[PDB]
Amino acid sequence: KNPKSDKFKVKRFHHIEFWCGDATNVARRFSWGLGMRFSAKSDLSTGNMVHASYLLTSGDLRFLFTAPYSPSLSAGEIKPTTTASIPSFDHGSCRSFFSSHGLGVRAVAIEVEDAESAFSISVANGAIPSSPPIVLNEAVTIAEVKLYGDVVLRYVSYKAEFLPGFERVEDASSFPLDYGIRRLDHAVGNVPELGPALTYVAGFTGFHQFAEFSGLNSAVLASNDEMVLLPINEPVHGTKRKSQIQTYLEHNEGAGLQHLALMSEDIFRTLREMRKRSSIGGFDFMPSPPPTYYQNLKKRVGDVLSDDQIKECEELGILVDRDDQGTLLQIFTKPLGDRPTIFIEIIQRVGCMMYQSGGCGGFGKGNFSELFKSIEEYEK
Amino acid sequence: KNPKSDKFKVKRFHHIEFWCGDATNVARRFSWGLGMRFSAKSDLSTGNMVHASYLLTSGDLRFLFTAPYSPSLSAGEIKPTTTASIPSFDHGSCRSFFSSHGLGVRAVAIEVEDAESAFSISVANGAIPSSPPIVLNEAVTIAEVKLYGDVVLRYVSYKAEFLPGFERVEDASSFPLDYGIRRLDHAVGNVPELGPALTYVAGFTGFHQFAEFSGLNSAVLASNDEMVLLPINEPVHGTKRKSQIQTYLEHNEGAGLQHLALMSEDIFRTLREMRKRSSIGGFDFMPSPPPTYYQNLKKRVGDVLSDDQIKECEELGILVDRDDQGTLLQIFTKPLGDRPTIFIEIIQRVGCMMYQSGGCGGFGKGNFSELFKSIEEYEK
Numbered sequence A, B: 001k002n003p004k005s006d007k008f009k010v011k012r013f014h015h016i017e018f019w020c021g022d023a024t025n026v027a028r029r030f031s032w033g034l035g036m037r038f039s040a041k042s043d044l045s046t047g048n049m050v051h052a053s054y055l056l057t058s059g060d061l062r063f064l065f066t067a068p069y070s071p072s073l074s075a076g077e078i079k080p081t082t083t084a085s086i087p088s089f090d091h092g093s094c095r096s097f098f099s100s101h102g103l104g105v106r107a108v109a110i111e112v113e114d115a116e117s118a119f120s121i122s123v124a125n126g127a128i129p130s131s132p133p134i135v136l137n138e139a140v141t142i143a144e145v146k147l148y149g150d151v152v153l154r155y156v157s158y159k160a161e162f163l164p165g166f167e168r169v170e171d172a173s174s175f176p177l178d179y180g181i182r183r184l185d186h187a188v189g190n191v192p193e194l195g196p197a198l199t200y201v202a203g204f205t206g207f208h209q210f211a212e213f214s215g216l217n218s219a220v221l222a223s224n225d226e227m228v229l230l231p232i233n234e235p236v237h238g239t240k241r242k243s244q245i246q247t248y249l250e251h252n253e254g255a256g257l258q259h260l261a262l263m264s265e266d267i268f269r270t271l272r273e274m275r276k277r278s279s280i281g282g283f284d285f286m287p288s289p290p291p292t293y294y295q296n297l298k299k300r301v302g303d304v305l306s307d308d309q310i311k312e313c314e315e316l317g318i319l320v321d322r323d324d325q326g327t328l329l330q331i332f333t334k335p336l337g338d339r340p341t342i343f344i345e346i347i348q349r350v351g352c353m354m355y356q357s358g359g360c361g362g363f364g365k366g367n368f369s370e371l372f373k374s375i376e377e378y379e380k
Ligand SMILES: Cc1c(C(=O)C2=C(O)CCCC2=O)ccc2c1c(=O)n(Cc1ccccc1)c(=O)n2C
Pocket: A186, A188, A218, A219, A231, A232, A233, A244, A259, A261, A286, A332, A345, A363, A364, A365, A366, A367, A368, A371
């Protein structure tokens, strides 16, 4: 069931902003490891004495990497005469963020029709304001409320090139890499208590629980057309294996986002390209499933994927789940940085054509039991 | 003239340690951009709850990348029961360093016969102690004194695998990249006043001024066999163009190291490999000289390099200087990180065979006037 209770008009995921201490080095690692292009910058070259910001794009996916300069560069400035292109930025908050959390996402941004309305309605509905609505160059409105931990939900709205004050990267500095990734599918937070976190963010968005049929307990909030998908996990204590959610909270110094799931139009090409670059600057992937997993996949998705295709999934380590309505292909990278905190999921969904409806196939929770049982079988 | 006034027995450059906020991402960018191998680690996987440290190697060159974890991970520890593998490390100093300076080198390490002697003699001769001598696993001794800014000179000495507590990276995680780079040639500091900085570090090392035949004023300190080369610059104010030294001090928040010069056994192969990767995660190079430069190189090094070779230098943008005793091939990357601070120089030296004697060819100071005049000619 979908009550379509969105309290304001939301469109799509717009961009993800990482806060780091050196934007250049994270951005170039990410661009090579993921096949994202260098498309827009805001930094000293563009008259910004406050922060360094570099945008990577693959299809509709927008990764923003931001780090502070020395405050001495902008010490004469005040907020009305700032040279920062993102007005919510703050040296102290950014430096506090990176040194408390290590590398991670500071903002999950969604495009809305009216970011000032979206902010007002949100705050009026219990959201903790983080940055008030600012109109950039009479063209773009930007507002931030608190989401969880030190992560903020960022509303952007356009009257009619990323943001005012970003210049387009000169073609000789922009190499057209592409491994297949096309858009952000979902962004997942880890919190210590799911209940209050659910009722807080559902309370100011009007997002509804998405029907989702060892480790955690979770639930997924979804906008009206279920294209903005915001899962949230909490740990399940007292087990035998320590919950990854609890390890996350311990190493992250509290609540934050666990993973970004990126949609590829061809998860097979994507993972071939990403695996080729794993050990030369790219990303590592979590260990593969035991062949007992793939020896049981023919019994479950043999109607969706052929024998050659299922064997292909065995090569790249791709996991496969399926809904009552769709099939899901997924795989998890190792953590993106020093700490065992944030990671990336590559996915592709099969089915639910009307366009594809959001969340087709679910989120892979079955692959936990498919993995445990598959481990037992291989042990033999 | 070489008085050989070293006050203790120094061997070679041993390693360079970068302090950052995320070691993983800087290390992987550096390894791809420079062709260095992932050879040793100390981190959570190795029982180190204090800091994450990853060593990259190309020939004899050792780049160490270190970042702090959350202090909460090691809050029960005291200095005698620490799990840090580098005992001089300090969460507060590291976080203060990265947030004051951005990405940069924290330590220039040199191997000595006796690091405890080297420390004692040094401090007794005016060096400001930074970390006292610690004997690691009855095998390695490590000591630090202050060099300039927040950069420390690091003495290491071996009785007879990098340091105790680093494990060797498993071969499947270690891809044998190599673009030709073989050793560190020199490490250069920018300070606000050369005089006091020279007399301070020459005072506790006994290093002598190396005979070196617009922008800065510099001088080079050298050990007995002139293989540990420590140039130092200060700005030349009141000019027309703002000194790069002064820009460095402004954006770095004070004194620090300006550049690392890495020796390649084949600067032509190195720069082809590095340029191939510039726009896909590697390093950019400073803009090339006007062809008027290369149209005048035949008049100067036509005895050392052939017509095909000089044209090759024109392709990769390599500059060429020469001593009274040797020839120098060199080129400068763009800054390694967000700030216009530290950068890397690739070099190869021709001549002075006895082995090659250190510093053969000088350091390229002529290429300033060769560049200005070459610009004037091309302007025409
Ligand atoms: C992250 C994730 C998801 C899913 O994406 C997420 C929630 O599960 C549910 C709510 C939102 C939804 O998006 C699904 C399956 C997963 C993983 C995952 O990280 N791993 C790695 C791992 C295995 C053992 C120990 C530690 C880690 C898996 O094996 N499976 C099977």
